[PDB]
Amino acid sequence: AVGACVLCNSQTSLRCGACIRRPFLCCKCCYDHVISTSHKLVLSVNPYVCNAPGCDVTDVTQLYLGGMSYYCKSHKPPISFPLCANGQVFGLYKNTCVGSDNVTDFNAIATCDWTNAGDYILANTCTERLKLFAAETLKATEETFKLSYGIATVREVLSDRELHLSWEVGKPRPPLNRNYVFTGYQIGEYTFEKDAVVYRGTTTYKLNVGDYFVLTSHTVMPLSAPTLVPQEHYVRITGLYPTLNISDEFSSNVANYQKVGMQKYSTLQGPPGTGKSHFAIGLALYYPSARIVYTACSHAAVDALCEKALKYLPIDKCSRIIPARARVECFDKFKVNSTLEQYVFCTVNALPETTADIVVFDEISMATNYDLSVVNARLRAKHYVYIGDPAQLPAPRTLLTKGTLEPEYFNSVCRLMKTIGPDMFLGTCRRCPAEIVDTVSALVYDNKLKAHKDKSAQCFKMFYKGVITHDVSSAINRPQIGVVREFLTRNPAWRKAVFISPYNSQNAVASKILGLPTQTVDSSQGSEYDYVIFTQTTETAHSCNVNRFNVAITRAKVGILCIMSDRDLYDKLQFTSLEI
């Protein structure tokens, strides 16, 4: 019942009983909270509630200290004092309290519902202590809301991959995509796609009628470590030992590797195809005796670093850390769960508590402030390297419905990269034809991204609005897909292209009609393909977001066809226009 104030670190015996996280607040900060919000329940060693029989007064502003007990105005003894007085709520340490001038920001964080983009803006521009409080509060709210979705029970099993579901009446249904993972009853985790529903299970299990699926929730632990440790700048390389014979394949990053060793943490912005994994793995080659923990949010990102390390690092010194409660198939070519190896590859959620000379945290645009705090709490390192690109996509915020979240507010690292700039920048795209490079360089990179490749003359655009149908909220554009079918009859080298759309439902229609592999933009992040076919599908904030569009067109190595709905983005594509 005694702790440190979330706003000013002062010792206190008070917590707000109305905030979902029950934060400690000192006598001064607690006053500013209760006098300006609906939160009136104050918790101490004992709760601040009227102590007379039958009384239900719990509003601290209507409560008084009589002796050592609390009473309302109708029950207080003649010798009593108001609990709220002199800008202070009575509690222990009433004279050491410092107070804070940021309580207004606390009050907004503590009372918002996380549906507006301004809640996330405030969560990223406040003090460091408030950032943790907002991250914890948001995550709890997100987790509790998962209880709002209905239960799904199998009515019949059509095949090994299709079934008919029964949805609980009185509650909304979750969208059926690869981001919504249900737990079956425990017969493993399942995902559903679109009355027949396509089901994918962790193991091939004989599903029965009556088995049910529940959205996988999770308890939310408190945070203690900052999103970023305080910065330090050193006179020379600290804790690391450079080689003298780094191969020329990695020598262009030597100066950047030196800078990594001169500061506590450093940020690297790497636009698509500019060599992020190459940078990350070369860091180990330049500091060959360093213990390096490579981490990121998704298994796919960690597995991509593993594939890179397999080519260049000693395999006997690598371990992939896979949580015992297995879920998906991870990289399998390293020793598994040998936490003490020199090179450890692990998703954030599964990080062991250990130390390292260097922590590399990849795909930083996808991280949240909760992730960044978890990484600092579990990994004590001499150097932290944050790799990513704030012009790519963030983690979906399931509660946000009003307003768009700009890159500067994705997390603390993206905020630094957007405000003061990244410590390092990989400036040459080696993956994409120059038509793409030139488009995105002007679109999101202030013309700072250079093309190494020539124009391919296989980059095409077509302006075709089509017809927009919907499966709930996921959009479909059958005319746009018909145009693609026509294109394929006349361009047989594209038979091997990957279809990309901003919508799962569109992708599903394309799979059946066109026969091509399909991917959503968001799931295509970190991937590359020779030929890509993109159908914008609709003109929405989702389909026109510049970060998503950047990602979409930068997956292609040789050629891309973009069937567009928005005039602005169509015009900016530096491609050859196709007729019809």
CB of 373 to Zn ion, least distance (A): 20
Whole-angstrom Cα distance, residue 248 to residue 484?
Answer: 43
Q: Residue 528: which of ligand ATP, Zn ion, none does it interact with, CB under 5 to 8 A by kind?
A: ligand ATP
Measured between alpha carbons, how far is residue 547 from residues 317, 359, 364 in Å?
Answer: 37, 27, 14
CB of 270 to ligand ATP, least distance (A): 5
For position 308 contacting ligand ATP by CB under 6 A, the verdict is yes
CB of 342 to ligand ATP, least distance (A): 12
Instruction: Tell me which residue of 538, 400, 474 sits closest to 177, measured CA to CA.
Output: 474
Binding range to ligand ATP, per CB under 6 A, among 234-242, 295-303, 447-455, 465-473: 234-242
Contact at 8 Å (CB) between 27 and 89? yes
For position 59 contacting ligand ATP by CB under 6 A, the verdict is no
Measured between alpha carbons, how far is residue 419 from residues 126, 269, 350, 444, 579 in Å?
Answer: 15, 13, 31, 15, 42
CB of 551 to ligand ATP, least distance (A): 11
The DSSP call for residue 453 is S
The gap from C-alpha 176 to its chain's centroid, in whole angstroms, comes to 20
Identity of the amino acid at 326: A
Owner of token pair 């929730």: 217
544 is known to lie in a ligand binding site: no
CB of 432 to ligand ATP, least distance (A): 9
For position 239 contacting ligand ATP by CB under 6 A, the verdict is yes
Structure-derived torsion over alpha carbons of residues 516, 522, 528, 534, reported in degrees to the nearest 10: 50
Owner of token pair 């077509």: 462
Owner of token pair 């003649």: 78
Q: Which residues bind Zn ion (CB under 5 A)?
A: 5, 7-8, 10, 16, 18-19, 26, 29, 39, 50, 52, 55, 57, 72, 75, 110
For position 249 contacting ligand ATP by CB under 6 A, the verdict is yes
Contact at 8 Å (CB) between 547 and 444? yes
- Strand 379-388 relative to strand 354-361, pairing: parallel
CB of 110 to Zn ion, least distance (A): 5
For position 501 contacting ligand ATP by CB under 6 A, the verdict is no
Q: Residue 26: which of ligand ATP, Zn ion, none does it interact with, CB under 5 to 8 A by kind?
A: Zn ion
Owner of token pair 């004590």: 380
For position 430 contacting ligand ATP by CB under 6 A, the verdict is yes
Instruction: Tell me which residue of 462, 441, 431, 449 sits closest to 558, measured CA to CA.
Output: 431
8 is known to lie in a ligand binding site: yes
CB of 130 to Zn ion, least distance (A): 12
# residues near ligand ATP by CB under 6 A: 19
Identity of the amino acid at 531: Y
Instruction: Tell me which residue of 296, 282, 522 sits closest to 424, measured CA to CA.
Output: 282
For position 278 contacting ligand ATP by CB under 6 A, the verdict is yes
- CB closer to ligand ATP out of 223 and 424: 424
For position 273 contacting ligand ATP by CB under 6 A, the verdict is yes
Which of 222, 229, 241, 314 forms a contact with ligand ATP (CB under 6 A)? 241
For position 450 contacting ligand ATP by CB under 6 A, the verdict is no
203 is known to lie in a ligand binding site: no
DSSP, residue by residue, 148-162: GSPPEEEEEE-SSSE
Binding residues: 5, 8, 16, 19, 26, 29, 33, 39, 50, 55, 72, 75, 270-277
The binding site for ligand ATP (CB under 6 A) comprises 238-239, 241, 249, 252-253, 270, 272-278, 289, 308, 430-431, 528
